[PDB]
Ligand binder design. Structure first.
Ligand code: NAG
Ligand code: NAG
Ligand code: CA
Ligand code: CA
Ligand code: CA
Ligand code: CA
Ligand code: CA
Ligand code: CA
Lengths: 397, 272, 49, 48, 265, 397
């Protein structure tokens, strides 16, 4: 894999650096590297494909070296170099498209797409130039096991769940208490709703708690915690649990008081925030506990008093909300984001070449069912395909 | 039950309890004698049964319980059916009577007996009222003070007591909540009970056959609400009223929902 | 793969080209006889072999 | 959608084209949502 | 507090048995006895109620938690029994001629019936299960039934001549009728002095306790002639006086209330 | 750690192979390894202990080598070898005890017991002889990432959980429907009970399901499934959830029909078995679903019809049971068994030398509360202490 990244990087740097008129003092090292790559590759025959609608291709490298005699590169040299480079680029794209599709429950880190097994030999190890990118660096590190980490902007770690929970229900659904939540991508919008506005409750206060349990630990998360969740703040017609009947939900927002956010780890508490909003930090957390309240206003104007009476009809249901969006984060494991096209490349390749469903990844690689069960085998294979996807995207975008 | 319930918003579940009972519903109308008087027929019950049969209700599911007068009906209303409809005529001289009947049947009550002589009672919250039923209930009340004396009344002279009910069969009395009252009631002819209001009774539906909406179910004067199961009609004959009810019973039944607390025959629970 | 069956309680699993008995697989013969076309045993395995 | 996500063989594809009950019910027993949704929609369209 | 629903309950087997809720349930509950007039008649004392109350006070039941409610006779009790308390006891005398009525009383109070009304002038009724019976209360019920065939015609009876109907009751104050489940019946009843109600027997009422005072155990609660069970709150005693019976009840009121259990509905 | 296992193995093989009368041809390689180890050690000063009742010991190595001139061994050589081996054995045992008692959430794989760090240095790497044992092998594999495996016989993977679940309950507990399970060590005994024998339920059938969700994956599990679980098959007096009241349970065992055992991984079903009892296999699974039924016999003789009446008393309660034992299995993680004593050695050391409760492990190392939350920190520390416990057990038993 390191040699695959090295091929991709030196081909990128050859298409960038080697241009007409440039100075050999700037590309001597890269030309020695390219010539060594050519030498190491000359005499090998590779096969690529053999799964789904991916064709079966054969590659046979017999090229000529690049002259070390010049001082200023001319177009008659660049043209030959690019004729040589386009073949390597097609070969690398095809290898990456062979490797992003395959899976294994046993040693997923161990390569597939047997051309890559061949490249893993000891006669190909002379190709390595530099491994600086994030994914390849974390690859080499996690192999030489150390404290690694990928940086993410707006990560997709929450599987899509839009659901509610009723702690007081009736068949007519006229006096309820409960909590609603949408956990999607990087956002959690939660809303505790009481139809009585905490009149029959003790101290005119009603509690709500929402516990989210991540499958992989994060670190150094920057979070934005705002009140007044939006998508649980307008009229609604929601179905019962059992699907028998429905019920109306006409919300009226109130502030959450004595609010609390606990970022935990293995049941232990790590960070705690009380009545703070806006930007917050979490140094490490596998679990989030939001705890908020609905406090009936002791004083009330005529309108709001006529909205919160002491009888059962309760045509305006009091609510207390919280939006929480993870903006940035850092994770030892590999996930999706709103910045990087690695998952998109992988899924697009699989969908294009009609890859049968395998033992490890879910059908179609739907991130919901892929993060609701993120077992080590899935994690390893996902890291591998994301790394070769980064590689392929350094060349063909 | 204390334990929680869960749900979702994407599913199309289709998985739900299926079971049996008495044959998938019952319905009971409460119509005034005046209706059968005007009709002057002895087959109209069967006529309405065979009509309801078009709306789905089988033969042995619809029933009619004639009641002579609102007061007579208020005297021990024994509703034991899975759906109850109450046609009720308008009379401006009976507003309080036909609002007390509504506050009694639409809402669910938990009643304890009361011994006027040996004890002096009081109300705790804004839902702990005193309901009295019988043939002629004349009630009189004397509030008391911290030192167990009277206030504008005398513990001995019943004439000094303040009158709140005169020649009423059903009375629903709300007095100041947080003081001890001394009561004088016609215990020979009426029984008084200390009742507490609970969640509503979704199994009954009142239908004011006549004039505009007047029923103030909530004793507090600030709400004056109107529930889904509180209907109005304009009438000049009774056959048209019944045909209307039958043509639009599915909406009545969509507005009514079977009970939740328990089974019972009267309009209130007894818990001593 | 051919799966036979009879009301008299006999059941033979064999191959098409080279008739050779095989262990009979219930929970496959059933899922096949449900949907896949079924054929009469006029030439049943004994006489066939 | 099926051929893309639940990568499909030549025989399964030909038989789904021909609308073959055998493979249709093999998928419906394999619990393929891409097909179960279509079939539930046929129900919700065959209601009345 | 999700009422109107039924949810899976869970627990464990490592939790320890908690304290004795006795000496608190007595205080926050009420006990109602139902004795016959013969008891107070034999006794001929005016303060026996205060006496039994001061005796209960030793067992724990406070003064105004106990109630006594007389009844002249088993049939007058069977006429609309209204048992509204938190623990009911019913002392029942034995009479071989009243066996069926004092078994119907048991089948009516020991259990919890879901009762829908009935109108005979309009409809013809049929039973659906083996627990959907017809209970008739009043002062003198005279019930006659005529089963019908598939085509709405009688079987050994005519749908006009009420005399040809089949008689199951004759001037009974309480009746509990089970008929063949699957056939429509036309009914004749003394509606003026009797109300009939179509009732389904649900699970039992753990709030009452019948105590037969005399003869051997005969009460066949279950209408089906296979079980003939003896429930836990179906007690027997042998008597020659009544003071001994009341002292027995008071001394063993804890076993009684352990056999009973506060209601569900 | 590898050098610790090397020390222990060559000391074991020295106490075994080096015996009177034997032949230098068989032990020359081991003697060269021993002398190399001595040359490496000599001049270094180690410290050990200093936690709980472990005394603080200072080890100074200045030893002589072992001759290579003989052909047959004599007692004058065995005695020297024994006097030189006893010191190393005491040193290794004390180091292993000092290492089994230390914990850390930060890099639990990296070594505590700083003498062991010193041995993990790069001058002490000449001591490695053979990393053959299963534990050290999987350690080296994990360091050089690969698909590992520990073969367990009767693994204690289930935490002790005896508990019931009532789906139709009352205050008097006289007509019940529910399921009762005892999940202990390597076995499960589940049983579904109905007091009505499915008389009112539809089709005279009642469904029961139990979903065991393991904490770690397993592979190549050999399992023994039987009907009619034993410990839920006799009269019982069980308390309710709140421990307020009790209820009786007088069972009558029937067979489970429509029985289905599903071994799942990531929610994807993997193995399915219908009405097959005896020896079965599961190849990869993180979850087990046992779904059986209670079917009212439609034809009944009098003695059994008198037990299932159509009335509520119900003094005989129909039951259907299933027992399931995981006789053998394989796991990419480390657990406890009925074959190996590593956990017992660890806990015995800790109980003997009175180590305070650590941040990671619970008090006393109750395997129930230590498998209930098998977090990665705990897993790492447990692998580590188990490895050094095996190492110590190879010397002192
Ligand atoms: C309801 O049934 C459908 C199909 O039988 C199933 O997919 C769904 O999961 C069931 N509902 C629940 C809550 O399991
Ligand atoms: C439970 O019973 C024991 C023994 O009588 C008693 O010591 C303890 O205080 C009781 N529990 C409570 C909460 O009173
Ligand atoms: Ca009035
Ligand atoms: Ca006055
Ligand atoms: Ca009041
Ligand atoms: Ca009788
Ligand atoms: Ca019957
Ligand atoms: Ca006759």
């Amino acid at each position: 894999m390191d040699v695959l990244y090295s091929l991709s990087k030196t081909l990128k740097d050859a298409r960038d650096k080697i241009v007409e008129g440039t100075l050999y003092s700037n590309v001597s090292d890269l030309i020695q590297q390219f010539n060594q790559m050519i030498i190491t590759m000359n005499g090998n025959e590779f096969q690529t494909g053999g799964i789904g609608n991916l064709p079966i291709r054969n590659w046979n490298f017999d090229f000529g070296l690049l002259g070390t005699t010049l001082l200023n590169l001319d177009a008659n040299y660049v043209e030959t170099a690019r004729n040589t480079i386009d073949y390597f680029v097609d070969f690398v794209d095809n290898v990456c498209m062979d490797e992003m599709v395959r899976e294994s429950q046993r040693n997923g880190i161990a390569p597939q797409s047997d051309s890559l097994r061949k490249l893993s030999g000891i006669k190909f190890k002379r190709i390595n130039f530099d491994n600086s990118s994030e994914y390849i660096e974390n690859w080499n590190l996690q192999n030489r096991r150390q404290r690694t980490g990928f940086t993410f902007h707006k990560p997709n770690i929450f599987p899509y769940s839009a659901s509610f929970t009723l702690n007081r229900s009736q068949p007519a659904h006229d006096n309820l208490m409960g909590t609603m939540w949408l956990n999607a991508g990087s956002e959690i919008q939660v809303a505790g709703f009481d139809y009585s506005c905490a009149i029959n409750a003790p101290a005119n206060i009603q509690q709500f708690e929402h516990i989210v349990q991540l499958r992989r630990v994060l670190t150094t998360a920057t979070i934005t915690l705002l009140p007044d969740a939006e998508r649980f703040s307008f009229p609604r017609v929601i179905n019962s649990a059992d699907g028998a009947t429905t019920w109306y939900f006409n919300p009226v927002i109130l502030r959450p008081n004595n609010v609390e956010v606990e970022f935990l780890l293995n049941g232990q508490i790590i960070n705690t925030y009380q009545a703070r909003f806006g930007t917050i930090i979490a140094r490490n957390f596998d679990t989030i506990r939001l705890s908020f309240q609905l406090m009936r206003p002791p004083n009330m104007t005529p309108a709001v008093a006529a909205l919160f009476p002491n009888a059962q009809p309760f045509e305006h249901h009091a609510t207390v909300g919280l939006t929480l969006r993870i903006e940035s984060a850092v994770c030892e494991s590999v996930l999706a984001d709103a910045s990087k096209t690695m998952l998109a490349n992988v899924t697009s390749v699989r969908q294009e070449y009609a890859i049968p469903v395998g033992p490890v990844f879910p059908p179609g690689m739907n991130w919901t069912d892929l993060i609701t069960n993120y077992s080590p085998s899935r994690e390893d294979n996902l890291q591998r395909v994301f790394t070769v996807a980064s590689i392929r995207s350094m060349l063909v975008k | 039950i204390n334990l929680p319930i869960t749900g979702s918003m994407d599913t199309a579940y289709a998985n739900s309890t299926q079971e049996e009972t008495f044959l998938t519903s019952t319905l009971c109308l409460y119509y005034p004698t005046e209706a059968a008087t005007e009709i002057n027929d002895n087959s109209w019950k069967d006529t309405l049964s065979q009509l309801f049969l078009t709306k789905g209700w089988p033969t042995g599911s619809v029933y009619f319980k004639e009641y002579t007068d609102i007061a007579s009906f208020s005297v021990d209303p024994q509703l034991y059916c899975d759906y109850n409809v109450v046609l009720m005529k308008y009379d401006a001289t009976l507003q309080l009577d036909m609002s007390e009947l509504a506050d009694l049947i639409l809402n669910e009550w938990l009643c304890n007996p009361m011994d006027i002589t040996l004890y002096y009672y009081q109300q705790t919250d804004e839902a702990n009222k005193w309901i009295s039923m019988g043939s002629s209930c004349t009630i009189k009340v004397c509030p008391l003070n911290t030192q167990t004396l009277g206030i504008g009344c005398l513990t001995t002279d019943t004439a000094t007591f303040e009158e709140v009910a005169t020649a009423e069969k059903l009375v629903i009395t709300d007095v100041v909540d947080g003081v001890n009252h001394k009561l004088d009631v016609t215990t020979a002819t009426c029984t008084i009970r200390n009742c507490k209001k609970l969640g509503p009774r979704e199994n009954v539906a009142v239908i004011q056959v006549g004039g505009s909406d007047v029923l103030d179910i909530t004793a507090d004067p600030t709400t004056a609400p109107q529930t889904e199961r509180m209907m109005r009609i304009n009438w000049k004959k009774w056959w048209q009223v019944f045909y209307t009810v039958v043509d639009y019973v599915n909406q009545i039944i969509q507005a009514m929902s079977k009970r939740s607390r328990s089974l019972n025959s009267a309009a209130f629970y007894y818990r001593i | 793969e051919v799966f036979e069956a009879g009301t008299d309680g006999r059941f033979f699993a064999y191959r098409v080209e080279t008739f050779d008995e095989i262990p009979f697989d219930v929970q496959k013969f059933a899922d096949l006889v449900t949907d896949s076309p079924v054929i009469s045993a006029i030439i049943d395995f004994k006489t066939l072999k | 959608n099926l051929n893309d996500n639940y990568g499909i063989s030549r025989q399964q594809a030909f038989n789904l084209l021909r609308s073959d009950p055998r493979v249709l019910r093999e998928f419906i027993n394999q619990d393929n949502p891409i097909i179960r949704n279509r079939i539930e929609q046929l129900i919700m369209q065959c209601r009345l």
